[PDB]
Structure 1
């Protein structure tokens, strides 16, 4: 596969180390600006499609509205506490829903919220 001018565009990843260092510095800056809160939002536990991988359990974008309601809070208030909320993900597994509810309940207990003022 060398019928083109590929020699004009030969991207060599010499920067790997510098890019990793820059990513670490960006993470440190985010922590400095987001010190009290975690760097990443609490993602749910979800099951994968593509049965070749359905046996695997992996994270997801955010909890569904039903999961948030069952967790004892609201979607609008959940976002401010860093809980990821998905308005398009429908719940179709009772076992996964129970695990998500338990995870949300544990997260609510582990979090401490400072006064709004």
Structure 2
């Protein structure tokens, strides 16, 4: 059962695994069916851009803090700032997030500017017009790309004061570590007459 020098393996195949095996033979088939569905869907909404204008958003964790991505919908704060209503925007392809908040100005401006860029670059047909077909684009995401904002210039002056940036990390960790203990010491000094 166990024999010469090999890595110890864990192959979870003690259930009736052979009944639940899926081979994705239809990889090519599904892709064709998906492109057809995209093709037919775009025709049915012939002038419309096949997508809703999605917002810009910072990724949650500390791992993806550095990255900014396409979110779900625009905040009602952002939409009011642009000058529109959620009921109207949902009809002109601007997806709206009621659960989202804005606690950050740069996301606020980047999304509002995304909104003004949308309005100036789209034309809404009146309900009783002549439907002047206007060369539909199939992607609102590709029309307004999500570009990561730039942080600083590529070359600046060097300034130094003598911190090493290592002491400040050790101090920040250590101050945090003993902060709770230092309150209890200060509480005792508060009660000691």
Aligned partners of 1:72 and 1:96: how far apart in 2? 17
**Structure 2: tracts of 5 or more residues without a match:** 1-11, 128-192
Shift of residue 70 of structure 1? 0.4
Aligned partners of 2:21 and 2:87: how far apart in 1? 48
Aligned partners of 1:10 and 1:99: how far apart in 2? 46
Give the aligned CA root-mean-square deviation in angstroms.
7.6
Aligned partners of 2:65 and 2:45: how far apart in 1? 35
Aligned partners of 1:96 and 1:45: how far apart in 2? 7
Q: What's the secondary structure of 2:63's corresponding residue?
A: helix
Shift of residue 48 of structure 1? 0.6
Given the two structures, how large is their TM-score scaled by the length of structure 1? 0.97
From 118, 121, 139, the counterpart of 1:107 = 118
- Structure 2 residue 108 is matched with structure 1 residue 97: yes
> Structure 1 segments of 4 or more deviating over 3 A?
none
Aligned partners of 1:8 and 1:63: how far apart in 2? 45
Higher share of residues assigned helix: 1
Shift of residue 74 of structure 1? 1.0
C-alpha distance after superposition, 1:58-98 (max 9, x if no partner): 00110000000001111111111010011110111101100
Shift of residue 21 of structure 1? 0.1
Given the two structures, how large is their TM-score scaled by the length of structure 2? 0.59
Aligned residues: 117
Shift of residue 47 of structure 1? 0.3
